[PDB]
Amino acid sequence: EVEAAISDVGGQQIFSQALLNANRRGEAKTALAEVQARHQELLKLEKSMAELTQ
């Protein structure tokens, strides 16, 4: 007559992935992309003070 055939229900697991804040944007965001123009200024101090020391 009868027996077993399909059984369980209460039993499962799940992993979990993750995205990230957008503002993050490219690494260049404050104190990163400005270092290009901040360097020309610093080269200006170096120079103007080279005039100073000479």
């Binding site: 901040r38 200024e41 610093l42 200006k44 101090l45 103007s48 003070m49 005039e51 100073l52």
Partner: peptide, 19 residues
């Protein structure tokens, strides 16, 4: 704003010391 102030101060000392 700090780096600009430093630059201005250095320029002024350069002027004083050319004189």
């Amino acid at each position: 704003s700090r780096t600009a102030e430093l630059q201005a101060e250095i320029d002024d000392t350069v002027g004083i010391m050319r004189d």
